[PDB]
Amino acid sequence: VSVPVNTLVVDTLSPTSWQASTFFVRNGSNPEQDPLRNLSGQAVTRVVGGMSTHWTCATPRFDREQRPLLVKDDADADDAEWDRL
Amino acid sequence: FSYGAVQQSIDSRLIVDWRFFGRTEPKEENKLWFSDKITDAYNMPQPTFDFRFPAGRTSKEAEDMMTDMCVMSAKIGGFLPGSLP
Amino acid sequence: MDIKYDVVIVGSGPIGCTYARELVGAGYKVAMFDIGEIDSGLKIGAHKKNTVEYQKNIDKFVNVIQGQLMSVSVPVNTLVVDTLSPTSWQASTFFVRNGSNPEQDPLRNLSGQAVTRVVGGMSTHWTCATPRFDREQRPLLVKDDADADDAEWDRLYTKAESYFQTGTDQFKESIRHNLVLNKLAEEYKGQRDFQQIPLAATRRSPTFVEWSSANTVFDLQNRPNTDAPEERFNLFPAVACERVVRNALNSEIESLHIHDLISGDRFEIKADVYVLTAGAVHNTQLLVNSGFGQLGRPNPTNPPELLPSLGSYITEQSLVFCQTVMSTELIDSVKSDMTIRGTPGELTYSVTYTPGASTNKHPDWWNEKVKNHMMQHQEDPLPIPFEDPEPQVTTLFQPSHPWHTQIHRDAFSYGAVQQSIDSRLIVDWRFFGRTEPKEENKLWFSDKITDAYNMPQPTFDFRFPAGRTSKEAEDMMTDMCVMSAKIGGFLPGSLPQFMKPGLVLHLGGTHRMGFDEKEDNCCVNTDSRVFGFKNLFLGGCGNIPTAYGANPTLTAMSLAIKSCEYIKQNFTPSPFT
Amino acid sequence: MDIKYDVVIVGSGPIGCTYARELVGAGYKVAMFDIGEIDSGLKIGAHKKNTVEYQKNIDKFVNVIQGQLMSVSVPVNTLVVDTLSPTSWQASTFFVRNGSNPEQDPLRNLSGQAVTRVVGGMSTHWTCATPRFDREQRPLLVKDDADADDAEWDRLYTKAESYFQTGTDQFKESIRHNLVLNKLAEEYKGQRDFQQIPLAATRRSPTFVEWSSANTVFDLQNRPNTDAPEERFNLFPAVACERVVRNALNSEIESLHIHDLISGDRFEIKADVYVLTAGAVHNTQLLVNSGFGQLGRPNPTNPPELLPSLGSYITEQSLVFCQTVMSTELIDSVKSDMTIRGTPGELTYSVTYTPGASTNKHPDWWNEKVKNHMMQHQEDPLPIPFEDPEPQVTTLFQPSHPWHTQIHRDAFSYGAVQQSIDSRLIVDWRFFGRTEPKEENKLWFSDKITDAYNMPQPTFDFRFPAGRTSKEAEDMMTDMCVMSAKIGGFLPGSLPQFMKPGLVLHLGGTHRMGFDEKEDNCCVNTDSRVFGFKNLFLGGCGNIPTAYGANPTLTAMSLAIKSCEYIKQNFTPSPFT
Ligand SMILES: *Cc1cc2c(cc1C)nc1c(=O)[nH]c(=O)nc-1n2C[C@H](O)[C@H](O)[C@H](O)COP(=O)(O)OP(=O)(O)OC[C@H]1O[C@@H](n2cnc3c(N)ncnc32)[C@H](O)[C@@H]1O
Ligand SMILES: *Cc1cc2c(cc1C)nc1c(=O)[nH]c(=O)nc-1n2C[C@H](O)[C@H](O)[C@H](O)COP(=O)(O)OP(=O)(O)OC[C@H]1O[C@@H](n2cnc3c(N)ncnc32)[C@H](O)[C@@H]1O
Ligand SMILES: *Cc1cc2c(cc1C)nc1c(=O)[nH]c(=O)nc-1n2C[C@H](O)[C@H](O)[C@H](O)COP(=O)(O)OP(=O)(O)OC[C@H]1O[C@@H](n2cnc3c(N)ncnc32)[C@H](O)[C@@H]1O
């Protein structure tokens, strides 16, 4: 999703090879991205069916502690709604 | 996922994967934003993250979760070299 | 070189030097031989880490260690390299190459086992951790009286600690030491105690520690000299000791065969007393080469008649390792007493504390160090001073946690590239397991293959025993994972792992001690005297017959002292002449 | 320690020892200081590879080398480690960590540049290759007469070769040496010559070579002693030399400031003559710290008035490296004179040759070695004896191939795991380029940042110059690829590559020599005397002002001899008292 500017030093190039004076924006890096405040592993999938064409298929339910409320002031009604859905 | 590029020397029937998944507190400071100048490969505003795992419960739980995987996995077998916690 | 001495000692490690310290001081005419050479500077056998340069570049000492660890038994290499050019000569089989030992089953090895051949032995590079063994880890010196046994060990360990200059105070003003030790102390709810690792070392300044070594125990200078005009001692480096000559009755040693590696010549040396302190592996090799035990691949059909337990019941410790990166919680606690205002590097930034405030969590000395660092180095985001000494923490082996622990910074496993993570954040974790002695676990020597010194090639037949030893090793791994978590998360590239078997270099039981040769399946008695022999003694960790997790050298030293007392009681030094 | 000497020498490397050998022998009262300590055994400053153990375990010496190469300038680390636990303290920026130099542009560095602080300097670990420079690589000692210039260099190199014990015969009976050298000799069609690398070394036996070092040049023992009762010399290890004190006119040095690293105390030493031989980097540092050149980041707006060329025109060699695995063709040629019948290990197997047969391609000595190996070791598939010495081959720099070459086995780049490929098959290739001196290429020192000895932090501003130097480096890579192919294919994991800039450790021109300070953009004249100063001399590769590919030490030594001749011509030793 967002790849920061690469800062690896490669100093074993031949002297004839063209060589950067700075760590410039290369190879699809996002110059807006702080590499230390990223989700570097975040990725997206553009194919019909999306990520469900490759996913692990684990489909647990959320218990109350993890789950948004669908009914505000009635935990039993909220449970019933989530159970049905 | 994480089969990697060379053949396991350890018999596959012995190997078990452990993945523990933490919950993250929603915090206003944690953002997904889009550049007003940089675009992605589809000429759309470039996604940029400003993200850190929140410092309190979320971080404490993540580390307790790591420990929990270490304790639980030990009941089944030792770690596979190259796939350490 | 004379042809006759009162006492000959094979090996100039810290255990060989224990015998020299005791016996040279008692007026014996002593010769000492080492296959290795004088390395460490003009202080013979001294710690190589004791240069100003290494202590300013501590990341480099790992290389010194690796450069003198020569693998004991390397199996035939079976890696397939099929990307050679078609013109390159290529093997049709996995043949014996590059010093591999064809006797070695690669799956029953201690692949990490290594030896060090330099004057001072492994004490020229060691970590200097010298804990005592509690009863559960320790051989008996007195059979049926635990109080008397305790008294004996207390007396011997106390003297050994004096020889090594063991202390527990050298790191007391380290912020990083404190941070780790205090946190662990408060979390174990009174049920485990944390203290400084006992270290054979003397601090010389805030940034220099004189680590102890063989040289500390005995300075290894030839005598008579000006400082000791009535002592008699000669050290002969680059001399391979190859065989001791038994009489027919196996009741006396009559000679030691030596090989001068410089001239190439071979000689035989006569002594009243022969002391072998060549290390756990090489003591055993020298004895098998002398007709003790059995040369060649073991067989039950035909077990050896002389010292049948030699090279059996060997023990090595399981060792687990990781590194951590200090928690935000701990880093923040360093500066908990500070009032911090503004942003570092800006005109209005300040860091202050109130000296003596009862609400302060740290004493003035700490807060001074921290304030000054934070104000003088606003480019630096950490509150820990740059030259803060390393942590040196342990919780010692107990029944409820039967492993030794070191929570510290070791010169080893720095590796070849610079840490991107700040060093002040990094802490090493090494937990050390105890291994049950089992007859099937062996160190044996080939009757055909020889090592680089033309001596019978050492070969291991070793597996960690299946029951208690294995269960404890895995519980020990878990314990390191749980405990380390209280300090910080794992450092990527140093995740929790078992180290290569034997890399720990704590091998014992190869020539083990007991009261009765047959009943205790052993090789030397509690005077370290080889059973049946009047004048042959063995020193070193090879004597330790028990399952121990703590570092063995101090215990081996203590046994050596007891052995020297026997020698003093039974052999008369020659007239000074 | 006295406060007054005839001659003070800073640094106990082979160049410092050249000055000591010359000047101590000529009757001067000499003091020598080294920031490093006595390491190498009782032979002070001797080669660390000269132990019996290292020559039986040559794969281990790489660690000794790495353990004393301390990086000169390490840039701020920018590796992103984002797999830390959320509890671990984590940087918001790439701040100065772990001894990084914030002055250093990581893209204009010699990241491989390193220094060695031990008595004997880098000659305690070096490869010992001592070729002469041909005219094209060599500074002029005589301006307008090439024959006179040749004569001068011949005389100086001949003496330098005597000091180092340089020879070209120590490997002549190596089958592997022969195999490589013979093949290359026959393939270059008379247009390039191959010979043994000239090596500062004396063979002691078929399996031991005494490599030369500083100690070979001067044994470094304090004098007067029994072997030299009328000489005067003192060596002071663990003494950081920090500044020389100029007079106002910059025409004399009046004192040397020293720091005893053991006591911590600082002192000043007076001499008639001051010789700086602290290495190419550290000579320059000591001079900048003394007010020569310019401290701080260079600026053209304000160029230095004292020795403006100091730290400019620096040169380092491009270095390309690979290893090869010997061709089937070459391995087969080893045994070309043998009649081979049956299968190894079977009853009918035999390997025979006809001694003296004119059709034989090898002499009897070779065929004997090969037959006996093949018959005695039928488990082994190679015809090369196990203890066959390594290849040591070169074709020296020439106009048509303007690089030095070493085709050999170096103690370096053995790395941390055992070769699966048989060692007898492996050959190292190192080709060394010459670098044009350019004003923009600098070694400078921070006015704010200090190194571990509290001295101004060295910082490089270096790129290989774009034209001839770069074109040649790439042609040199190609030349190694073409030439190596005649011997074998590349060894996987050692493919052809440029080494990290400066890892070659052949830095020159930091305090360069010439005839005229202004016209030749230089710092010392042909007596190695600093321009304007009566009594300050510089020694080492920092003096070499030319683009050179061959290893510089012998040339630096030769210059040092010429410098000592000037000292002998102009300074009177003090009365022996
Ligand atoms: C990659 C992956 C994901 C995964 C997983 C294992 C892997 C290897 N395991 C999972 C599991 O065990 N249990 C589970 O609940 N989730 C697991 N996942 C994640 C899961 O696949 C996703 O949560 C799920 O697929 C999300 O579904 P959703 O329908 O919301 O989104 P999608 O699959 O990413 O599909 C979106 C589609 O939209 C198209 N797209 C994107 N942008 C545009 C625009 N601008 N215009 C038109 N179309 C667009 C994408 O092409 C994609 O197909
Ligand atoms: C390498 C190492 C070891 C070590 C350690 C860290 C490292 C990196 N940390 C330790 C620690 O913190 N606490 C501790 O108790 N031990 C630690 N060690 C292990 C320790 O160094 C050894 O236990 C200790 O040195 C053993 O002493 P010992 O005197 O018994 O043996 P040695 O040091 O190996 O010396 C033996 C000498 O004998 C010579 N030799 C070998 N064979 C021969 C023959 N055939 N002839 C003549 N001489 C011989 C060797 O050259 C050696 O010098
Ligand atoms: C590391 C290395 C070097 C090397 C080589 C292989 C390796 C692994 N192979 C070589 C080869 O085959 N042929 C050759 O010509 N050179 C090779 N080298 C390089 C060679 O070792 C050096 O060129 C040579 O040693 C340079 O000699 P020099 O005497 O000029 O300098 P030194 O050896 O670096 O010694 C300097 C001493 O000075 C002390 N010092 C440094 N600073 C101070 C201060 N401030 N005060 C007091 N003393 C100081 C150092 O401690 C060092 O001992």
Determine if ligand 3 sits within 6 Å of the CB of residue D446.
Answer: no
* B13: CB partners within 8 A, 6+ apart: none
Buried residues in D417-451 as b, exposed as e (16+ CB within 10 A): ebbbbbbbbbbbbbbbbbbbbbeebbbbbbeebeb
Give the one of D41, D67, D92 whose C-beta lies nearest to C37's C-beta. Answer: D41
Buried residues in D348-359 as b, exposed as e (16+ CB within 10 A): eeebebeeeeee
Nearest CA among C540, C510, C496, C517 for reference residue C435: C510
Tell me which chain D residue has its CA closest to the CA of residue B66: D85
The verdict on whether omega for the bond into residue B47 sits within 30 degrees of 0, i.e. cis, is no
Experimental method: X-ray
Secondary structure of C261-307 in the HEC alphabet? CCCCCEEEEEEEEEEECCCHHHHHHHHHHCCCCCCCCCCCCCCCCCC
Residue C562 and residue C550 in contact, taking contact as beta carbons nearer than 8 Å: no
Residue D399 and residue D136 in contact, taking contact as beta carbons nearer than 8 Å: yes
Determine if ligand 2 sits within 6 Å of the CB of residue C323.
Answer: no
Shortest-distance atom of ligand 2 to CA C33: 47
D397: exposed, middle or buried (Cβ count in 10 Å: 0-12, 13-18, 19+): buried
Residue C537 and residue C256 in contact, taking contact as beta carbons nearer than 8 Å: no
Q: What CA–CA distance (Å, rounded) separates D552 from D504?
A: 11
User: What does the CA dihedral D47, D424, D131, D473 come to, rounded to 10 degrees?
Assistant: -120
Give the one of A2, A33, A66 whose C-beta lies nearest to B23's C-beta. Answer: A66
Q: Resolution in A, one decimal?
A: 1.8
Among this protein's residues, is D506 annotated catalytic?
Answer: yes
* C331: CB partners within 8 A, 6+ apart: C382, C383, C384, C425, D89
Where do the domains of chain C lie? 1-326+389-577, 327-388
CB hemisphere CA count around D245 (13 angstroms): 11
Q: What CA–CA distance (Å, rounded) separates D406 from C71?
A: 30
Ligand 3 binding pocket mutation candidate from D58, D122, D406 (most atoms within 8 A of CB): D122
Query: What distance, in Å, lies between the first and last C-alpha atoms of chain C?
Result: 15
* Interface membership of B8 toward A (CB under 8 Å): no
DSSP designation for D278: S
D245: exposed, middle or buried (Cβ count in 10 Å: 0-12, 13-18, 19+): middle
In the structure encoding, which two tokens stand for residue C120, read together? Answer: 């001072």
Residue C408 known to bind ligand: yes
DSSP for B21-73, written as a single string: -------TT-EEEEEEEEE-TTSSEEEEEE----TTHHHHHHHHHHHHHHHHH
Residue D236 and residue D1 in contact, taking contact as beta carbons nearer than 8 Å: yes
- Known catalytic residues of C? 506, 551
Residue D113 known to bind ligand: no
Yes or no, beta carbons of D85 and C453 under 8 Å apart: no
Nearest CA among D72, D80, D81 for reference residue D103: D72
Q: What is the radius of gyration, based on Cα positions, of chain B?
A: 19
User: What does the CA dihedral C142, C143, C147, C153 come to, rounded to 10 degrees?
Assistant: 30
DSSP designation for A32: T
CA geometry: angle C264, C265, C267, nearest 5 deg: 140
| Crossing angle (nearest 10°) for helices C146-164 and C14-25 | 90
Residue C100 and residue C76 in contact, taking contact as beta carbons nearer than 8 Å: yes
Q: What CA–CA distance (Å, rounded) separates A14 from D496?
A: 11
Neighbours of D319 (CB within 10 A): 25
Yes or no, beta carbons of C498 and B67 under 8 Å apart: no
Give the architecture (CATH level 2) of D327-388: 2-Layer Sandwich (3.30)
**How many whole angstroms from A26 Cα to the centroid of ligand 1?**
28
The SS3 assignment for D253 reads: strand
Yes or no, beta carbons of D91 and C60 under 8 Å apart: no
Q: What CA–CA distance (Å, rounded) separates C305 from C1?
A: 36
CA geometry: angle D457, D459, D461, nearest 5 deg: 165
The SS3 assignment for C260 reads: strand
CB hemisphere CA count around D102 (13 angstroms): 10
Tell me which chain D residue has its CA closest to the CA of residue B65: D85
CA distances for A3 relative to A7, A10, A39, B51, angstroms: 12, 19, 9, 14
Shortest-distance atom of ligand 1 to CA A58: 12
**How many whole angstroms from B60 Cα to the centroid of ligand 1?**
29
**Where do the DSSP E strands lie in D365-487?**
392-394, 403-408, 426-433, 442-450, 456-461
Query: What distance, in Å, lies between the first and last C-alpha atoms of chain D?
Result: 15
Q: What CA–CA distance (Å, rounded) separates C56 from B50?
A: 39
Q: What CA–CA distance (Å, rounded) separates D277 from D11?
A: 5
| Crossing angle (nearest 10°) for helices D14-25 and D553-570 | 30
Q: What CA–CA distance (Å, rounded) separates D432 from C84?
A: 26
Q: What CA–CA distance (Å, rounded) separates C283 from C117?
A: 13
Nearest CA among C360, C320, C323, C318 for reference residue C487: C323
Cβ neighbours of B74 in C, within 8 Å? 474-475, 477-478
* Interface membership of A4 toward D (CB under 8 Å): yes
A39: exposed, middle or buried (Cβ count in 10 Å: 0-12, 13-18, 19+): middle
